[PDB]
Design brief:
2 copies of one chain form a homodimer.
Chain A (H helix, E strand, L loop, with lengths): L1 H59 L2
């Protein structure tokens, strides 16, 4: 029984391992998406700031 | 044959712990990232509002 019990437990733990791996994969993709969004918004912030600057430049030339 | 199964059992438990922790970390980082996204959206809105006000001021000639 020692060995059959160990088999039961091993299969169970392997299943748990797979479940956790799935969770980690999902969460990882979510994190990747959020990070990439952050970068995107850095670029966009830079651009928008540049346009705000264009306001001042153009006005300085009237 | 038993010692092998014991070995594997412990190995699997260790892997479990590692994954619990890695998942916890990843969730923390996801939370941080989403707060960053939110904050930056708000900064952007503030900036477009600033833009509107400034342009409206310039258009007053």
């Amino acid at each position: 029984n020692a060995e059959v019990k160990l088999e039961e437990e091993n299969r169970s733990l392997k299943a748990d391992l797979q479940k956790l791996k799935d969770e980690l994969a999902s969460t990882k993709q979510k994190l990747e998406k959020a990070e990439n969004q952050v970068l995107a918004m850095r670029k966009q912030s830079e651009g928008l700031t540049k346009e705000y600057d264009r306001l001042l430049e153009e006005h300085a030339k009237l």
